[PDB]
């Protein structure tokens, strides 16, 4: 049916090797059309795991991660380490909503566990360090939206999207 | 000092209270007492006086009622409770001006009796609007409180 997975966009380089399937289907929910990105997924109460960057759950609504939601399945050596959910596409905290969704979905979240040997404080993080912005443009938004540098020669707008729109939280460690 | 203005407020209120005979007239005057002092000190004395006189409908009957009221205390104000309440407030103001020596009772009572003289009364008021606004505030606030206390909310 409808099978997606959440490629979060931190300044951590744990991005491209996360999913077998670059497209697989057709309906990528995260789009890019002449005004920037669209339908960015946002998971609250979860922060990043910079050492093997992954979504560790805290009970804190003040923590969140903002990334793209693309059809696929993770790397085939997974799902002993993921959160597979079936959601009616209206529970999803979508940012820059553009169209409407298929009323039911399957989302694959890169999941971890707290490992409660140390208090898991967090820190708000933005995206900077231009080499990061450039290799996130190429190694992600070309592996999926290869139409960039083909049809969107306006990559200036999409790098501005990345700089402004993807802020997240980390585990301070 | 303005302590006299509470005696003045009390007697003028007793007047315009036992003048308005129907209770709807009383509650209308209560609303006037509340809002018209706010308007006087937000907009000015002259604008609010023009507004009052325009809603008081100064005919011969109303004006003889007002004059007899200055004198009698047996008069009774009739005639369309909104208008009768605006005229009660007009009387409150004029009564202050008289009983405190700003307008002369003779000049005023003349002016309510004739039509060439209503305009000159209004002109005379305009020429003393700063003094009237300055001096009438305590009196008007007392009247407003008296109406809130003695006349039942509508």
């Amino acid at each position: 049916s409808t099978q997606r997975e959440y490629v979060f966009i931190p300044i951590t380089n744990s991005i491209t090797i996360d999913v077998k399937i670059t497209i697989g289907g057709s309906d990528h929910i995260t789009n890019i059309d002449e005004r920037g990105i669209h339908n960015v997924l946002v998971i609250t109460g979860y922060a990043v795991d910079e050492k093997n960057g992954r979504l560790v759950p805290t009970l804190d609504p003040c923590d969140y991660v903002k990334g793209i939601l693309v059809a696929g399945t993770p790397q085939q050596a997974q799902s002993n380490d993921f959160l597979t959910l079936k959601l009616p596409a209206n529970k999803l905290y979508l940012i820059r909503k553009k169209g409407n969704i298929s009323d039911d979905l399957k989302i694959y979240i890169p999941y971890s566990s707290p490992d409660a040997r140390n208090s898991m404080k967090t820190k708000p993080v933005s995206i900077s360090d231009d080499t990061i912005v450039n290799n996130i443009i190429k190694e992600v938004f070309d592996k999926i939206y290869n139409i960039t540098q083909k049809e969107k020669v306006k990559i200036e707008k999409v790098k501005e999207d990345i700089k402004e729109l993807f802020s997240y939280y980390a585990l301070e460690q | 000092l303005y302590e006299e203005d509470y005696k003045l407020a009390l007697e003028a209120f007793k007047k315009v209270f036992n003048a308005l005979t129907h209770y709807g007239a009383k509650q209308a005057f209560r609303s006037r007492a509340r809002d018209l002092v706010e308007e006087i000190y937000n907009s000015g004395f002259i604008p609010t006086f023009f507004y009052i006189i325009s809603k008081a409908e100064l005919n011969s009957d109303s004006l003889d009622s007002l004059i007899s009221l200055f004198s009698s205390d047996n008069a009774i104000l009739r005639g369309s409770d909104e208008n009768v309440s605006y005229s009660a407030y007009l009387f409150i103001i004029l009564y202050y001006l008289i009983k405190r020596g700003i307008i002369e009772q003779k000049f005023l009572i003349q002016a309510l009796r004739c039509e060439k003289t209503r305009l000159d009364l209004i002109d005379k008021l305009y020429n003393l609007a700063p003094i009237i606004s300055a001096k009438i505030r305590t009196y008007l606030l007392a009247i407003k409180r008296l109406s809130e206390a003695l006349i039942e909310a509508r």
Binding site: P61 | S43, F50
Partner: protein, 285 residues
């Protein structure tokens, strides 16, 4: 950051809108629209806050505690409120048009001024420094518009001339046919020098004389006649919703403001006035 979240938005009037400004003796309209500090219509954030707060309280009755936290209590305030509404600046009023020097015939158009844009830019510039959020997109759009100050300017069209609200003639210039229209609509937006913009905006407002008829005989009541003032439907106001760091602020910005589109602003609701749509800038631009 002084503010946890900062959420600018646009208020689009679905129907006509009447937020009352109180009546005075020297007023010339019984029921006048709330005015700005320089004459244009606005919505005092008192009205925004009360409106949206009532709407939320009745539509999200389970999240009552979150509402009361971010928008203050009703019964006993033992503390301030973490949420803050800025007064809604009129963004763009719709105005009748008769075309000259053009190609596509439009029946109406959006009108805004440089002073309204400067007030919006002040809002944006201050809210960026007072929070973790920058609004570089809206900021750059507004600044590349404000570069062309003094000159009347059309945004997406090529009108080059027009007659607005039947009386006022403007010779426009095309800013740039690559600047994405801030207004999501497909109708053009004119940014006018203010001396003429205020006249156009005054003639866009809708004045309406109502009467009260006696309910025993179809003849009016003595004194039952007044006038009213509305902003046309399709008017846009720009505001900001600001929150101080909290846990309830996260829930508010998380799933209250993402389930908050239509509200009822102002009064005259029985007359079907004041249905409003909020359009968060976080996703509209």
């Amino acid at each position: 950051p002084y503010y946890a979240f900062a959420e600018p938005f646009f208020i689009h009037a679905i129907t006509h809108l009447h937020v009352g400004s109180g009546s005075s003796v020297e007023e010339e309209i019984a029921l006048p629209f709330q005015r700005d500090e320089l004459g244009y219509p606005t919505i005092y954030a008192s009205s925004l806050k009360g409106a949206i707060k009532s709407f939320l309280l009745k539509e999200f009755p389970d999240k009552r505690d979150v509402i009361y936290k971010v928008l203050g209590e009703d019964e006993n305030p033992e503390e301030a409120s973490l949420g803050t509404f800025l007064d809604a600046i009129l963004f763009a009023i719709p105005s009748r048009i008769i075309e000259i020097d053009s190609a596509k015939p439009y029946v109406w158009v959006y009108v805004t001024t440089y002073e309204l844009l400067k007030k919006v830019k002040l809002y944006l510039d201050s809210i960026s420094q007072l929070s973790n959020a920058s609004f570089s997109n809206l900021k750059n759009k507004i600044d590349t518009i404000l570069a062309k100050e003094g000159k009347n300017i059309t945004l997406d069209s090529d009108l080059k001339s027009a007659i607005l609200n039947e009386d006022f003639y403007v010779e426009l210039e095309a800013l740039n046919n690559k600047i994405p229209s801030i207004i999501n609509a497909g109708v053009p937006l004119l940014v006018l020098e203010d001396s003429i913009g205020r006249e156009v905006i005054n003639r866009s407002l809708i004045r309406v004389r109502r009467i009260r008829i006696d309910r025993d005989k179809k003849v009016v009541e003595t004194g039952g006649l007044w006038s009213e003032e509305y902003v046309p439907m399709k008017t846009i106001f720009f505001s900001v919703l600001l929150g101080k760091e909290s846990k309830e602020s996260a829930i508010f910005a998380s799933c209250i403001l993402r389930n908050l589109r239509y509200v009822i602003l102002g009064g005259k609701e029985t007359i079907g006035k004041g249905i409003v749509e909020l359009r968060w800038v976080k996703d509209v631009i």
